[PDB]
Amino acid sequence: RIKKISIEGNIAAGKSTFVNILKQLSEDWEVVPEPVARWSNVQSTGGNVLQMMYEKPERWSFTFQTYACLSRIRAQLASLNGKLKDAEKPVLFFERSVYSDRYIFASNLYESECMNETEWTIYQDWHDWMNNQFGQSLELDGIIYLQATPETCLHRIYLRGRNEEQGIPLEYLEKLHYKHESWLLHRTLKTNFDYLQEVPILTLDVNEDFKDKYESLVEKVKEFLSTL
Amino acid sequence: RIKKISIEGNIAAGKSTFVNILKQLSEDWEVVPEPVARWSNVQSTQDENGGNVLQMMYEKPERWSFTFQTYACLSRIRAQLASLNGKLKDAEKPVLFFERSVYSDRYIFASNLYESECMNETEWTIYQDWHDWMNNQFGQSLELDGIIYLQATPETCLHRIYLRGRNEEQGIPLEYLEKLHYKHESWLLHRTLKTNFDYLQEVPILTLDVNEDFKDKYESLVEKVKEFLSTL
Ligand SMILES: O=c1ccn([C@@H]2O[C@H](COP(=O)(O)OP(=O)(O)O)[C@@H](O)[C@H]2O)c(=O)[nH]1
Ligand SMILES: O=c1ccn([C@@H]2O[C@H](COP(=O)(O)OP(=O)(O)O)[C@@H](O)[C@H]2O)c(=O)[nH]1
Ligand SMILES: O=c1ccn([C@H]2C[C@H](O)[C@@H](COP(=O)(O)O)O2)c(=O)[nH]1
Ligand SMILES: O=c1ccn([C@H]2C[C@H](O)[C@@H](COP(=O)(O)O)O2)c(=O)[nH]1
Ligand SMILES: [Mg+2]
Ligand SMILES: [Mg+2]
């Protein structure tokens, strides 16, 4: 019975950065980071299935997207049962969606011919099902679109220095950025999950370095939150 | 209220052949076959010609062992779960026969493919958690009440595989069948296969020797089933 909100955007736009700005001096706010740490070592509930994916996508992209998405829905679900339901005015923020996996990233790869048509049918059969009983409660109350041009994104992918993702072309980020605008701005993107069409969208321009200029966005979120 | 019973055995032992003799036998009896149909042609799940993932897994197992086993298990979990909600729930002595359980998927077919090196370490690591957590979530509904093992020599299975005519599996070596036979015997007969799900060790099994052609001489066996069920 908490306000579940997704912090969405591109590769190193600054999601995890703002997620940690929000984790701070907000007792009624706790964040759920995408398991990009647990995708790096694949062990018992290591091996790098993200690097394997980035390396031979026309091979591991499917195995990966499946593990990636499962790890999300596992962590997301588990967070609420525990944590702090008792607090009076709670908000739980999710680094990425279960939807962004299927509709922006896994779709992207399929189109980029990394996912065999039959790999795509399976992924979808799987996803449309995982989010029925497990992603039942786990439904969204709002999405925060951290907008950043693919241009800055690329500099900030290096600025990070994550080696698996250093061989990323602007053209890739560019093709992602378009799936984003199509989903969260223009809203031309059509999903199987029909409630998602109506839910709110706070667009924030994170092109301008917000590391020590966070105080404005946080006001604009506190606003967006009063709404829901 | 619904008794759940697994019909287990090696490839082409006579699971469906046996399960259809019992489906006819009573009104309070119903079967849940394995979705080999949706594996042969992978479709978009529509209600009011897709690839063959089983053929893919066969011709190049290095590549489709994991992909198939995941789909295979999902489709099973999906199908089974569906049967319980069906209209036959209100009856006196209603049983359910399942063509293979979610345990044979992992502990026989998936594990062997990992032993045969077709599926890599991290491919295996992923499978297991997935199968664990997924199965554990909403687990109570699917617990078996008993298992029926249809015992046939790997050579009988090779004959029945040929008797069937499944193009894709017409290349299955004796050794493959021989390997799977050992994993069934280990689990369902010698009862030495340790599985994560602990309830299993306490479920009653009924082993039958389908080495002789039962399409005709089924009378003896059924009566055994009937009495095995009276003791559940
Ligand atoms: O105001 C900011 C926010 C982020 N970053 C850089 O952006 C990356 C962090 O982005 P993050 O991983 O948080 O975003 P996500 O990957 O979740 O999109 C790193 O390179 C940071 O140094 C930056 O330089 N200034
Ligand atoms: O006593 C028997 C049992 C089976 N079969 C044939 O053997 C093949 C494999 O049987 P089935 O599909 O039932 O085996 P399963 O794969 O279900 O264990 C089929 O063509 C059956 O008609 C047969 O001729 N006689
Ligand atoms: O559905 C997803 C989600 C994430 N990623 C990868 C992209 C990034 O390299 C890595 C971490 O995400 P960012 O925080 O860098 O966006 O996750 C995918 O490939 N597919
Ligand atoms: O978990 C499974 C289940 C089935 N099969 C294969 C073996 C058979 O060729 C076919 C199913 O038919 P029978 O098991 O009914 O023979 O799928 C597997 O490899 N793994
Ligand atoms: Mg990240
Ligand atoms: Mg069969």
Side-chain angles (χ1 to χ4, degrees), chain A residues 2 5-22 24 26 28-29 31-37 39-55 57 59-73 75-80 82 84 87 90-174 176-178 180-189 191-196 199-207 209-210 214 216-219 221 223-228, chain B residues 1-2 4-22 26 28-29 31-37 39-46 49-59 61-86 88 90-91 94-139 141-178 180-182 184-193 195-201 203-211 213-214 216 218-223 225-232:
Chain A
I2 326 183
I5 284 109
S6 172
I7 288 160
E8 265 284 280
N10 213 345
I11 287 164
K15 287 177 261 92
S16 295
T17 301
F18 176 58
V19 110
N20 277 251
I21 292 284
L22 247 61
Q24 293 308 124
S26 318
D28 273 49
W29 310 349
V31 301
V32 180
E34 57 174 11
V36 67
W39 304 342
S40 302
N41 58 335
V42 183
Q43 62 202 42
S44 58
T45 183
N48 201 319
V49 78
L50 182 126
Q51 144 215 284
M52 273 157 151
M53 169 249 197
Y54 274 98
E55 276 195 291
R59 172 62 173 92
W60 297 99
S61 64
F62 174 74
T63 292
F64 175 72
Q65 275 297 143
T66 287
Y67 186 72
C69 172
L70 170 79
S71 304
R72 183 173 307 286
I73 176 135
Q76 294 210 165
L77 266 161
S79 80
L80 39 116
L84 289 181
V91 195
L92 179 66
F93 302 96
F94 301 131
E95 202 203 331
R96 285 235 164 83
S97 302
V98 175
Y99 313 90
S100 56
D101 293 343
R102 191 204 203 274
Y103 290 108
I104 115 92
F105 279 91
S107 184
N108 174 59
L109 287 143
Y110 154 72
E111 294 167 276
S112 282
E113 270 186 28
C114 320
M115 269 185 63
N116 175 282
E117 261 261 271
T118 89
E119 273 189 305
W120 186 228
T121 322
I122 294 187
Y123 180 83
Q124 288 177 280
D125 206 279
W126 190 88
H127 195 282
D128 275 341
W129 196 78
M130 301 291 285
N131 298 92
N132 274 358
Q133 50 294 290
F134 317 100
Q136 208 158 34
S137 62
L138 218 68
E139 166 192 45
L140 283 163
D141 300 311
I143 323 162
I144 283 169
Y145 180 29
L146 302 184
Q147 162 157 198
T149 68
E151 260 71 345
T152 42
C153 266
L154 185 68
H155 170 252
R156 288 186 207 186
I157 63 86
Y158 176 77
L159 228 57
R160 166 150 69 192
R162 215 190 272 160
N163 294 294
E164 316 103 4
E165 60 184 39
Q166 195 72 190
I168 218 163
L170 175 70
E171 291 97 17
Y172 178 83
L173 283 152
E174 206 227 15
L176 296 163
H177 191 81
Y178 302 153
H180 274 104
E181 308 276 72
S182 180
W183 183 37
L184 306 155
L185 286 193
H186 321 309
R187 279 207 149 115
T188 68
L189 209 145
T191 76
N192 192 31
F193 314 91
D194 276 287
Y195 86 102
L196 222 74
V199 59
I201 28 70
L202 176 85
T203 316
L204 299 169
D205 183 282
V206 295
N207 265 295
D209 168 85
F210 64 93
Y214 72 113
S216 55
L217 299 100
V218 152
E219 276 307 301
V221 304
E223 198 182 38
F224 174 72
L225 284 160
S226 71
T227 318
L228 295 174
Chain B
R1 187 174 283 95
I2 294 169
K4 299 149 266 153
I5 307 99
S6 195
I7 314 302
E8 290 285 5
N10 207 0
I11 309 161
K15 283 167 252 105
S16 41
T17 299
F18 184 55
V19 175
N20 59 57
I21 304 175
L22 309 146
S26 193
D28 302 289
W29 290 5
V31 310
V32 191
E34 72 191 322
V36 81
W39 307 334
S40 273
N41 195 291
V42 293
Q43 230 212 305
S44 64
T45 59
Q46 293 177 335
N49 41 335
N52 188 331
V53 68
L54 179 87
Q55 193 212 271
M56 289 163 140
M57 186 266 303
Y58 276 123
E59 273 158 57
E62 291 73 66
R63 181 63 180 86
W64 307 100
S65 278
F66 175 70
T67 306
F68 168 78
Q69 280 300 153
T70 304
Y71 193 70
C73 194
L74 192 96
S75 53
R76 178 86 49 75
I77 287 179
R78 236 188 183 184
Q80 293 177 335
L81 288 164
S83 170
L84 295 69
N85 296 2
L88 177 63
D90 64 341
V95 319
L96 257 190
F97 299 111
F98 294 156
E99 186 163 295
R100 294 243 182 81
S101 54
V102 296
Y103 316 104
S104 51
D105 284 313
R106 178 177 149 170
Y107 296 105
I108 289 142
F109 294 82
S111 205
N112 173 257
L113 261 51
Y114 164 72
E115 315 204 348
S116 315
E117 299 133 82
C118 322
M119 228 190 341
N120 48 337
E121 291 301 319
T122 54
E123 258 182 308
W124 186 225
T125 302
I126 281 159
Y127 185 78
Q128 287 173 123
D129 181 65
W130 177 77
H131 183 286
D132 257 328
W133 171 81
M134 154 144 55
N135 212 308
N136 192 31
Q137 212 72 186
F138 292 47
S141 165
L142 291 213
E143 307 194 351
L144 290 158
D145 284 279
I147 320 173
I148 310 158
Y149 172 42
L150 301 190
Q151 192 176 97
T153 78
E155 297 96 334
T156 301
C157 285
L158 229 169
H159 199 248
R160 307 270 182 86
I161 278 178
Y162 173 82
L163 260 38
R164 179 133 77 179
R166 217 173 253 161
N167 297 263
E168 55 255 51
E169 77 195 12
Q170 292 301 125
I172 281 174
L174 177 69
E175 308 88 73
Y176 185 58
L177 279 163
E178 197 210 35
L180 298 183
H181 172 95
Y182 298 149
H184 280 94
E185 288 271 295
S186 275
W187 171 43
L188 308 148
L189 193 89
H190 303 279
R191 285 194 97 140
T192 68
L193 177 63
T195 62
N196 164 80
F197 312 86
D198 296 280
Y199 90 87
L200 263 92
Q201 71 218 336
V203 305
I205 53 99
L206 168 96
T207 58
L208 307 166
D209 188 76
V210 289
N211 272 277
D213 213 273
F214 71 97
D216 59 292
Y218 60 79
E219 291 93 358
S220 46
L221 295 174
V222 321
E223 306 306 92
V225 163
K226 280 148 103 172
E227 216 69 359
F228 166 68
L229 285 156
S230 64
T231 59
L232 300 173

